[PDB]
Design a protein around this ligand. Structure first.
Ligand SMILES: [Pt+2]
Ligand SMILES: [Pt+2]
Ligand SMILES: [Pt+2]
Length: 76
């Protein structure tokens, strides 16, 4: 399944993922491609912040969906 992840800077990266993949896995994939540590990653889809433990299937994330990446500020 192709999905897109869009950053707040507007860059999109393309991932290949499956319904069985957890959000933890997706963040790992994003770190590989983009270099962002998972602990800083906050994903949003369908107006929901995505739970590391859950699968893309739990959120009904299908082909060509876009997830929004927001970074969580560590150290105000
Ligand atoms: Pt695929
Ligand atoms: Pt945009
Ligand atoms: Pt969007």
């Amino acid at each position: 399944m192709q999905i897109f992840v869009k950053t707040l800077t507007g860059k999109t990266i393309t991932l290949e993922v499956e319904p069985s993949d957890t959000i933890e896995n997706v963040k790992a994939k994003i770190q590989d491609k983009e270099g962002i540590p998972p602990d800083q990653q906050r994903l949003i889809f369908a107006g929901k912040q995505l739970e590391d433990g859950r699968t893309l299937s739990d959120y009904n994330i299908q082909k060509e969906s876009t997830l929004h990446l927001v970074l969580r500020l560590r150290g105000g």
